Amino acid sequence: GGVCPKILQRCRRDSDCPGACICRGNGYCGYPYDVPDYA
Secondary structure, three states, X not given: OOOEXXXXXXXXXXXXXXXXXXXXXXXXXXXXXXXXXXX
8 A cells, every 4th residue: 555665764744754655653654665464
């Protein structure tokens, strides 16, 4: 889904995550590509 091709990154806000990356409740941006169970 909102899976980021980028690296695991923390989010302070949504705009803080470049690309289609939004901030998640986990405290990080949209799950990176290396997370295979997320789409």
